Amino acid sequence: REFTIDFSTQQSYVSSLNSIRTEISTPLEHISQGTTSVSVINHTPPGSYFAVDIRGLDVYQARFDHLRLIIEQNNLAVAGFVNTATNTFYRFSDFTHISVPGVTTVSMTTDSSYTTLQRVAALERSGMQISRHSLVSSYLALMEFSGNTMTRDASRAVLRFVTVTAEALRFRQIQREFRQALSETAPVYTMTPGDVDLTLNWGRISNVLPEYRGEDGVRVGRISFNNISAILGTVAVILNCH
Q1: Beta pairing partners, 70
Q2: Which one is catalytic: 29, 144, 167, 184?
Q3: CATH number of the domain encompassing residue 100
Q4: Domain count, the chain
Q5: Is 215 an active-site residue?
Q6: Type and span of the H or E element at 25
Q7: Please, which residues have CB within 8 angstroms of residue 147's CB and are 6 or more apart in sequence?
Q8: Which domain holds residue 33?
């Protein structure tokens, strides 16, 4: 199973994400108003995965279109990044249960946690700047990467792509704020501390929403939801808590 996330324009980027969401998840009958709904990841056998092809970074600088991510379906966890030009799967430590056929799997020493990636990158997610220019630079770091230990530039590149591909699928707020950077008058998306709080509390969040029967509001951790228009505008896909 393969998907394309096209960063050409805002429309192609949003349609790419919503294409993945409907294939791998199903909306809740309690929180769903039109096309905008909060979905639950479809149950899949553990170890299942889908591919993500990073297209559309820039058309004028000749087609940086050979980067691929491997994502575990059960938890939307990026297991690694694939260099299709070299047919090399640079895979993290904690995803040994993810084997991709037809490629070469370089098993590394670094795991996938934000604790390790932030340290090696020397870059805080709170205040991290993602733009179309910096996304192109993030692509180059991952393509020019070789070895089995994550370098500073690669982690400064993985942190950016995971935020705009994996966490963007989970949280609609992250997708909405970043997609502005793909416009003609390209701004710079700046990851606020509130955006970081969302990603750190995904497990707590996915455990709550199935309860929601249309009450007044919801407060999990520091995440205060005033109404359902906040839920639909902040969270997009939640875990399948069985």
Answers
A1: 51, 80
A2: 167
A3: 3.40.420.10
A4: 1
A5: no
A6: strand 25-33
A7: none
A8: 2-238
